[PDB]
Amino acid sequence: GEVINQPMMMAAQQLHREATKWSSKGNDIIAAAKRMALLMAEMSRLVRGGSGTKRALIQCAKDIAKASDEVTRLAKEVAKQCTDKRIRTNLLQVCERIPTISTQLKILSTVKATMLDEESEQATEMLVHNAQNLMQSVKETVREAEAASIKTDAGFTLRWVRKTP
Amino acid sequence: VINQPMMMAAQQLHREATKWSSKGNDIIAAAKRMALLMAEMSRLVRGGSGTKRALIQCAKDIAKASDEVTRLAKEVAKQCTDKRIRTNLLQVCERIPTISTQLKILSTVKATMLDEESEQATEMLVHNAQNLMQSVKETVREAEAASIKIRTDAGFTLRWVRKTPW
Numbered sequence: 417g418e419v420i421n422q423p424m425m426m427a428a429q430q431l432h433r434e435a436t437k438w439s440s441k442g443n444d445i446i447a448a449a450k451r452m453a454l455l456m457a458e459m460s461r462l463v464r465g466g467s468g469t470k471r472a473l474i475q476c477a478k479d480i481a482k483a484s485d486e487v488t489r490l491a492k493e494v495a496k497q498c499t500d501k502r503i504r505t506n507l508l509q510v511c512e513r514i515p516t517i518s519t520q521l522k523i524l525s526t527v528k529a530t531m532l533d534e535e536s537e538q539a540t541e542m543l544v545h546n547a548q549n550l551m552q553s554v555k556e557t558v559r560e561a562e563a564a565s566i567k568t569d570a571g572f573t574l575r576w577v578r579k580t581p
Numbered sequence: 582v583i584n585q586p587m588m589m590a591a592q593q594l595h596r597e598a599t600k601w602s603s604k605g606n607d608i609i610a611a612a613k614r615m616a617l618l619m620a621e622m623s624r625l626v627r628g629g630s631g632t633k634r635a636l637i638q639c640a641k642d643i644a645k646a647s648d649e650v651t652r653l654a655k656e657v658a659k660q661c662t663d664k665r666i667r668t669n670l671l672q673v674c675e676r677i678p679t680i681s682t683q684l685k686i687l688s689t690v691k692a693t694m695l696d697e698e699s700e701q702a703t704e705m706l707v708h709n710a711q712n713l714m715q716s717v718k719e720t721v722r723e724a725e726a727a728s729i730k731i732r733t734d735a736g737f738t739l740r741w742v743r744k745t746p747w
Contacts, residue, residue: 422624422627423583423628424626425624425717426621426624426625426635428630429617429620429621429623429624430635432617432621433617433618433621433639433642436614436617442678538589579610579614581607581610581611581614581646581648581649581650
Protein backbone atom coordinates (compact mmCIF):
# COMPACT_ATOMS: atom_id res chain seq x y z
CA GLY A 417 0.00 0.00 0.00
CA GLU A 418 1.87 3.06 1.45
CA VAL A 419 4.86 1.40 3.31
CA ILE A 420 7.07 3.79 1.35
CA ASN A 421 10.27 5.42 2.49
CA GLN A 422 8.88 8.58 4.09
CA PRO A 423 12.30 10.40 4.41
CA MET A 424 12.89 9.83 0.71
CA MET A 425 9.29 10.96 0.27
CA MET A 426 9.38 14.22 2.32
CA ALA A 427 12.62 14.83 0.30
CA ALA A 428 11.04 13.83 -3.05
CA GLN A 429 7.99 15.95 -2.26
CA GLN A 430 10.08 18.89 -0.94
CA LEU A 431 11.55 18.86 -4.43
CA HIS A 432 8.16 18.38 -6.18
CA ARG A 433 6.67 21.50 -4.42
CA GLU A 434 9.42 23.67 -5.93
CA ALA A 435 9.12 22.27 -9.48
CA THR A 436 5.27 22.21 -9.49
CA LYS A 437 5.27 26.07 -9.33
CA TRP A 438 5.91 26.06 -13.00
CA SER A 439 4.90 24.78 -16.42
CA SER A 440 7.07 22.12 -18.06
CA LYS A 441 6.41 23.67 -21.53
CA GLY A 442 9.66 25.22 -22.75
CA ASN A 443 11.57 24.00 -19.67
CA ASP A 444 13.34 20.60 -19.67
CA ILE A 445 14.90 21.25 -16.22
CA ILE A 446 11.41 21.66 -14.73
CA ALA A 447 10.22 18.52 -16.54
CA ALA A 448 13.31 16.49 -15.56
CA ALA A 449 12.84 17.81 -11.95
CA LYS A 450 9.18 16.61 -11.82
CA ARG A 451 10.31 13.18 -13.37
CA MET A 452 13.07 13.00 -10.72
CA ALA A 453 10.43 13.81 -8.09
CA LEU A 454 8.21 10.92 -9.33
CA LEU A 455 11.13 8.47 -9.68
CA MET A 456 12.46 9.24 -6.22
CA ALA A 457 8.92 8.72 -4.95
CA GLU A 458 8.77 5.47 -6.92
CA MET A 459 12.10 4.42 -5.44
CA SER A 460 10.60 5.26 -2.06
CA ARG A 461 8.05 2.42 -2.57
CA LEU A 462 10.33 -0.48 -3.86
CA VAL A 463 13.35 0.42 -1.63
CA ARG A 464 11.98 -1.77 1.24
CA GLY A 465 10.82 -4.55 -1.12
CA GLY A 466 11.90 -8.10 -0.32
CA SER A 467 12.57 -9.67 -3.72
CA GLY A 468 11.88 -9.11 -7.42
CA THR A 469 12.11 -5.33 -7.17
CA LYS A 470 15.88 -5.58 -7.44
CA ARG A 471 15.93 -4.80 -11.19
CA ALA A 472 13.34 -2.07 -10.55
CA LEU A 473 15.44 -0.48 -7.73
CA ILE A 474 18.25 0.04 -10.23
CA GLN A 475 16.11 1.03 -13.29
CA CYS A 476 14.83 3.67 -10.87
CA ALA A 477 18.28 4.91 -9.72
CA LYS A 478 19.57 4.56 -13.32
CA ASP A 479 16.79 6.78 -14.73
CA ILE A 480 17.25 9.21 -11.81
CA ALA A 481 20.97 9.52 -12.64
CA LYS A 482 20.09 9.96 -16.37
CA ALA A 483 17.69 12.77 -15.45
CA SER A 484 20.31 14.31 -13.16
CA ASP A 485 22.77 14.31 -16.07
CA GLU A 486 20.23 16.20 -18.16
CA VAL A 487 19.54 18.72 -15.33
CA THR A 488 23.32 19.26 -14.97
CA ARG A 489 23.69 19.53 -18.78
CA LEU A 490 20.97 22.18 -19.06
CA ALA A 491 22.21 24.11 -16.04
CA LYS A 492 25.74 24.32 -17.63
CA GLU A 493 24.18 25.85 -20.79
CA VAL A 494 22.17 28.28 -18.62
CA ALA A 495 25.38 29.28 -16.73
CA LYS A 496 27.47 29.71 -19.97
CA GLN A 497 25.16 32.57 -21.04
CA CYS A 498 24.70 34.06 -17.57
CA THR A 499 26.19 37.58 -17.45
CA ASP A 500 25.95 37.73 -13.63
CA LYS A 501 29.22 36.70 -11.94
CA ARG A 502 27.63 35.62 -8.61
CA ILE A 503 24.61 33.73 -10.08
CA ARG A 504 26.93 31.97 -12.59
CA THR A 505 29.31 30.92 -9.75
CA ASN A 506 26.46 29.43 -7.66
CA LEU A 507 24.98 27.71 -10.75
CA LEU A 508 28.40 26.25 -11.60
CA GLN A 509 28.73 25.03 -7.98
CA VAL A 510 25.77 22.65 -8.34
CA CYS A 511 26.75 21.42 -11.85
CA GLU A 512 29.77 20.06 -9.93
CA ARG A 513 27.81 18.65 -6.98
CA ILE A 514 24.98 16.97 -8.96
CA PRO A 515 27.11 14.48 -10.95
CA THR A 516 28.94 13.33 -7.79
CA ILE A 517 25.66 12.67 -6.00
CA SER A 518 23.94 10.89 -8.90
CA THR A 519 26.87 8.58 -9.42
CA GLN A 520 26.92 7.74 -5.70
CA LEU A 521 23.14 7.14 -5.68
CA LYS A 522 23.59 4.54 -8.48
CA ILE A 523 26.32 2.79 -6.42
CA LEU A 524 24.34 2.85 -3.17
CA SER A 525 21.07 1.77 -4.76
CA THR A 526 22.75 -1.21 -6.43
CA VAL A 527 23.99 -2.13 -2.91
CA LYS A 528 20.62 -1.96 -1.10
CA ALA A 529 19.42 -3.86 -4.31
CA THR A 530 21.64 -7.03 -3.90
CA MET A 531 20.76 -6.97 -0.13
CA LEU A 532 17.07 -7.85 -0.65
CA ASP A 533 21.95 -8.27 9.13
CA GLU A 534 22.42 -4.72 10.40
CA GLU A 535 24.56 -3.88 7.37
CA SER A 536 21.33 -3.81 5.32
CA GLU A 537 19.88 -1.13 7.65
CA GLN A 538 22.99 1.12 7.20
CA ALA A 539 22.76 0.64 3.38
CA THR A 540 19.28 2.28 3.75
CA GLU A 541 20.62 5.25 5.78
CA MET A 542 23.45 5.91 3.33
CA LEU A 543 21.03 5.79 0.41
CA VAL A 544 18.56 8.15 2.21
CA HIS A 545 21.36 10.61 3.08
CA ASN A 546 22.58 10.66 -0.52
CA ALA A 547 19.00 10.86 -2.00
CA GLN A 548 18.35 13.90 0.22
CA ASN A 549 21.44 15.65 -1.05
CA LEU A 550 20.31 15.01 -4.61
CA MET A 551 16.80 16.42 -4.12
CA GLN A 552 18.26 19.49 -2.37
CA SER A 553 20.84 20.18 -5.07
CA VAL A 554 18.20 19.95 -7.81
CA LYS A 555 15.94 22.37 -5.90
CA GLU A 556 18.94 24.73 -5.58
CA THR A 557 19.63 24.30 -9.33
CA VAL A 558 16.02 25.20 -10.22
CA ARG A 559 16.19 28.47 -8.21
CA GLU A 560 19.62 29.59 -9.44
CA ALA A 561 18.58 28.85 -13.06
CA GLU A 562 15.33 30.84 -12.62
CA ALA A 563 17.38 33.82 -11.29
CA ALA A 564 19.86 33.34 -14.18
CA SER A 565 16.99 33.73 -16.72
CA ILE A 566 16.44 37.33 -15.48
CA LYS A 567 19.94 38.54 -16.50
CA THR A 568 22.96 39.38 -24.51
CA ASP A 569 23.27 37.78 -27.99
CA ALA A 570 22.07 34.34 -26.68
CA GLY A 571 19.77 31.82 -28.48
CA PHE A 572 19.09 29.40 -25.54
CA THR A 573 16.03 29.88 -23.33
CA LEU A 574 14.27 28.12 -20.48
CA ARG A 575 10.64 29.20 -20.18
CA TRP A 576 9.82 30.00 -16.47
CA VAL A 577 5.99 30.38 -16.48
CA ARG A 578 4.84 30.22 -12.84
CA LYS A 579 1.44 29.72 -11.29
CA THR A 580 1.76 32.37 -8.51
CA PRO A 581 -1.65 32.53 -6.79
CA VAL B 582 4.82 7.76 9.84
CA ILE B 583 2.93 10.59 8.14
CA ASN B 584 0.14 12.16 10.21
CA GLN B 585 -2.65 9.96 8.81
CA PRO B 586 -5.50 12.35 9.78
CA MET B 587 -3.63 15.25 8.01
CA MET B 588 -2.78 13.14 4.94
CA MET B 589 -6.39 11.91 4.77
CA ALA B 590 -7.81 15.41 4.68
CA ALA B 591 -5.31 16.45 1.98
CA GLN B 592 -6.15 13.25 0.06
CA GLN B 593 -9.87 14.10 0.07
CA LEU B 594 -9.28 17.75 -0.81
CA HIS B 595 -7.19 16.47 -3.74
CA ARG B 596 -9.84 13.94 -4.80
CA GLU B 597 -12.36 16.72 -5.11
CA ALA B 598 -10.07 19.12 -7.04
CA THR B 599 -8.60 16.46 -9.38
CA LYS B 600 -12.07 16.09 -11.00
CA TRP B 601 -11.53 19.47 -12.67
CA SER B 602 -9.08 20.74 -15.23
CA SER B 603 -6.99 23.62 -13.92
CA LYS B 604 -7.18 25.40 -17.30
CA GLY B 605 -9.35 28.49 -16.86
CA ASN B 606 -9.76 27.84 -13.11
CA ASP B 607 -7.33 29.36 -10.56
CA ILE B 608 -9.36 28.07 -7.60
CA ILE B 609 -8.96 24.49 -8.87
CA ALA B 610 -5.23 25.11 -9.41
CA ALA B 611 -4.78 26.74 -5.98
CA ALA B 612 -6.81 23.83 -4.47
CA LYS B 613 -4.49 21.19 -6.07
CA ARG B 614 -1.51 23.21 -4.88
CA MET B 615 -3.07 23.27 -1.32
CA ALA B 616 -3.82 19.50 -1.30
CA LEU B 617 -0.19 18.75 -2.20
CA LEU B 618 1.25 21.22 0.34
CA MET B 619 -0.89 19.65 3.02
CA ALA B 620 0.32 16.20 1.91
CA GLU B 621 3.95 17.28 2.33
CA MET B 622 3.06 18.74 5.70
CA SER B 623 1.67 15.39 6.86
CA ARG B 624 5.29 14.17 6.30
CA LEU B 625 6.71 17.11 8.26
CA VAL B 626 4.88 16.72 11.60
CA ARG B 627 6.73 13.54 12.55
CA GLY B 628 10.02 14.41 10.85
CA GLY B 629 13.16 15.39 12.71
CA SER B 630 14.50 18.88 13.34
CA GLY B 631 15.91 21.08 10.59
CA THR B 632 12.94 20.33 8.37
CA LYS B 633 11.14 23.13 10.27
CA ARG B 634 12.10 25.58 7.58
CA ALA B 635 10.21 23.22 5.31
CA LEU B 636 7.21 23.31 7.74
CA ILE B 637 7.21 27.11 8.15
CA GLN B 638 7.52 27.54 4.37
CA CYS B 639 4.71 24.95 3.77
CA ALA B 640 2.30 26.77 6.13
CA LYS B 641 3.21 30.11 4.47
CA ASP B 642 2.46 28.92 0.94
CA ILE B 643 -0.71 27.21 2.14
CA ALA B 644 -1.96 30.47 3.67
CA LYS B 645 -1.00 32.39 0.50
CA ALA B 646 -3.00 29.90 -1.58
CA SER B 647 -5.93 30.13 0.88
CA ASP B 648 -5.93 33.90 0.42
CA GLU B 649 -6.14 33.45 -3.35
CA VAL B 650 -8.97 30.88 -3.01
CA THR B 651 -10.84 33.32 -0.72
CA ARG B 652 -10.23 36.28 -3.14
CA LEU B 653 -11.51 34.30 -6.14
CA ALA B 654 -14.52 32.94 -4.26
CA LYS B 655 -15.55 36.53 -3.31
CA GLU B 656 -15.46 37.53 -7.02
CA VAL B 657 -17.48 34.41 -7.91
CA ALA B 658 -20.06 35.28 -5.21
CA LYS B 659 -20.34 38.99 -6.30
CA GLN B 660 -21.73 37.83 -9.68
CA CYS B 661 -23.82 34.97 -8.33
CA THR B 662 -27.53 35.66 -8.93
CA ASP B 663 -28.61 32.84 -6.59
CA LYS B 664 -29.34 34.09 -3.06
CA ARG B 665 -28.69 30.75 -1.29
CA ILE B 666 -25.53 29.74 -3.23
CA ARG B 667 -24.12 33.27 -2.75
CA THR B 668 -24.81 33.09 1.03
CA ASN B 669 -23.03 29.73 1.39
CA LEU B 670 -20.10 30.96 -0.77
CA LEU B 671 -19.82 34.10 1.37
CA GLN B 672 -19.85 31.94 4.54
CA VAL B 673 -16.56 30.23 3.64
CA CYS B 674 -14.85 33.45 2.42
CA GLU B 675 -15.23 34.40 6.10
CA ARG B 676 -14.07 31.06 7.55
CA ILE B 677 -10.99 30.40 5.41
CA PRO B 678 -9.02 33.54 6.37
CA THR B 679 -9.46 32.72 10.09
CA ILE B 680 -8.27 29.17 9.59
CA SER B 681 -5.28 30.03 7.37
CA THR B 682 -4.01 32.63 9.77
CA GLN B 683 -4.28 30.16 12.67
CA LEU B 684 -2.53 27.42 10.66
CA LYS B 685 0.47 29.76 10.15
CA ILE B 686 0.61 30.45 13.93
CA LEU B 687 0.24 26.78 14.89
CA SER B 688 2.74 25.54 12.30
CA THR B 689 5.36 27.97 13.57
CA VAL B 690 4.87 27.00 17.22
CA LYS B 691 5.05 23.36 16.19
CA ALA B 692 8.25 23.89 14.15
CA THR B 693 10.04 25.27 17.21
CA MET B 694 9.33 21.92 18.96
CA LEU B 695 10.81 19.51 16.37
CA ASP B 696 6.30 15.78 25.90
CA GLU B 697 2.55 16.40 26.16
CA GLU B 698 3.05 20.08 25.30
CA SER B 699 4.54 19.18 21.90
CA GLU B 700 1.91 16.46 21.42
CA GLN B 701 -0.81 18.98 22.01
CA ALA B 702 0.82 21.40 19.50
CA THR B 703 0.44 18.51 16.97
CA GLU B 704 -3.26 17.93 17.80
CA MET B 705 -4.10 21.62 17.52
CA LEU B 706 -2.33 21.79 14.16
CA VAL B 707 -4.14 18.64 12.90
CA HIS B 708 -7.54 19.99 14.03
CA ASN B 709 -6.94 23.29 12.27
CA ALA B 710 -5.49 21.67 9.07
CA GLN B 711 -8.63 19.50 8.85
CA ASN B 712 -10.89 22.53 9.05
CA LEU B 713 -8.89 24.16 6.25
CA MET B 714 -9.10 21.20 3.88
CA GLN B 715 -12.85 20.89 4.53
CA SER B 716 -13.58 24.56 3.94
CA VAL B 717 -11.66 24.53 0.65
CA LYS B 718 -13.54 21.45 -0.52
CA GLU B 719 -16.80 23.23 0.38
CA THR B 720 -15.59 26.35 -1.48
CA VAL B 721 -14.82 24.33 -4.63
CA ARG B 722 -18.37 22.85 -4.68
CA GLU B 723 -20.24 26.06 -3.94
CA ALA B 724 -18.21 27.90 -6.64
CA GLU B 725 -18.91 25.12 -9.18
CA ALA B 726 -22.67 25.40 -8.41
CA ALA B 727 -22.36 29.22 -8.65
CA SER B 728 -21.01 28.87 -12.23
CA ILE B 729 -24.35 27.30 -13.31
CA LYS B 730 -26.41 30.42 -12.46
CA ILE B 731 -24.27 33.44 -13.37
CA ARG B 732 -24.99 37.15 -13.91
CA THR B 733 -25.65 38.27 -17.49
CA ASP B 734 -23.62 41.52 -17.16
CA ALA B 735 -20.50 39.61 -15.98
CA GLY B 736 -16.89 39.51 -17.31
CA PHE B 737 -15.42 36.99 -14.77
CA THR B 738 -15.42 33.26 -15.42
CA LEU B 739 -14.12 30.10 -13.81
CA ARG B 740 -13.96 27.22 -16.27
CA TRP B 741 -15.44 24.05 -14.86
CA VAL B 742 -14.48 21.17 -17.13
CA ARG B 743 -14.27 17.55 -15.90
CA LYS B 744 -11.18 15.50 -16.83
CA THR B 745 -11.49 11.84 -15.73
CA PRO B 746 -15.18 11.82 -16.70
CA TRP B 747 -14.65 13.88 -19.88
